[PDB]
Every structure is written in C-alpha cells, then in structure tokens.
Amino acid sequence: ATGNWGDQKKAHQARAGVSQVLNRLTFASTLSHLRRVNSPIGRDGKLA
DNA sequence: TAACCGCCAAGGGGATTACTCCCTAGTCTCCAGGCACGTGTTTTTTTTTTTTTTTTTTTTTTTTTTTTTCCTTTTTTTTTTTTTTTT
Numbered sequence: 001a002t003g004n005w006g007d008q009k010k011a012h013q014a015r016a017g018v019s020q021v022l023n024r025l026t027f028a029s030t031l032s033h034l035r036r037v038n039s040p041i042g043r044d045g046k047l048a
Numbered sequence: 049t050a051a052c053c054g055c056c057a058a059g060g061g062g063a064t065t066a067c068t069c070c071c072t073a074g075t076c077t078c079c080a081g082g083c084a085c086g087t088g089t090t091t092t093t094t095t096t097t098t099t100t101t102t103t104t105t106t107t108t109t110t111t112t113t114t115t116t117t118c119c120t121t122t123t124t125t126t127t128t129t130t131t132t133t134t135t
Contacts (some may be wrong), residue, residue: 009121021116026081044109 015040 006014023033 004118008119046109 002011003016003019004011004014005016005018017023020033023029045048
C-alpha cells in the first residue's frame with residue numbers, strides 16, 4: 001500500500017515507488033502501467 | 049766408493065811493531081729550531097619553516113501548478129485487579 005519495499009521502521013533504506021496506484025483513466029493507460037519498467041538510478045544524475 | 053787418516057809440500061795472509069795523522073773529545077759562546085701553551089674554523093647536530101601531497105569535510109543539485117494514498121507506533125516489562133484454593 002505505501003510502496004516502501006522493506007521494514008516499516010527502516011523504510012528510509014527501502015526503495016519507494018515499487019507499488020503504485022493503478023492508472024484507471026483509459027484501457028491503454030492501464031496496459032501501459034501494467035507493462036512499466038523502472039530504472040533504479042535516481043532522477044538527479046547529470047550523467048546521460 | 050770416497051770418508052778418513054797419514055804424509056808431504058807449498059803458499060797466503062793475519063798477527064806484530066813502529067810511524068804518522070787526522071778526526072773527534074772537550075770546552076766555550078751564540079743563536080735557533082723544538083716544544084709547551086692557546087686556539088681555530090670546519091663538522092656534526094638540532095631547530096625551523098616551508099612544501100607537497102593526501103585525506104577529510106561540507107555543500108550543492110531550474111522554477112511553477114494539479115490529483116491521490118499511508119501514516120500520523122509498538123512490543124515489552126511492570127503493575128493492579130480478579131479469581132480460586134485452603135484451613
């Protein structure tokens with residue numbers, strides 16, 4: 001439910017965004033959300 | 049087989065006596081290197097300030113806007129009331 005993939009007390013060391021709310025806007029949006037792949041690199045890197 | 053002994057022969061040079069001479073022993077007298085004393089200028093040691101690289105710390109990561117979801121403790125020890133058993 002929360003999305004933190006680990007212990008509740010030690011959720012700061014756990015990854016966030018593994019579990020997401022399913023996008024029920026269209027059928028195609030649901031199919032795109034069911035076939036999504038996420039990179040573990042954070043969204044602040046200057047390396048391209 | 050020639051060491052050794054006996055016998056004989058020959059000669060060479062150290063010992064002896066005398067004359068000489070010359071070099072050193074001895075004694076003054078002047079003076080100068082040999083030596084006692086003081087010290088040095090290089091040599092080592094110690095500080096002193098810098099240098100140079102390594103390591104650690106710290107701070108940073110464009111802005112604005114709109115929706116959900118989950119959570120906003122929890123086990124663990126101590127206390128306190130209740131219930132049951134016994135004389």
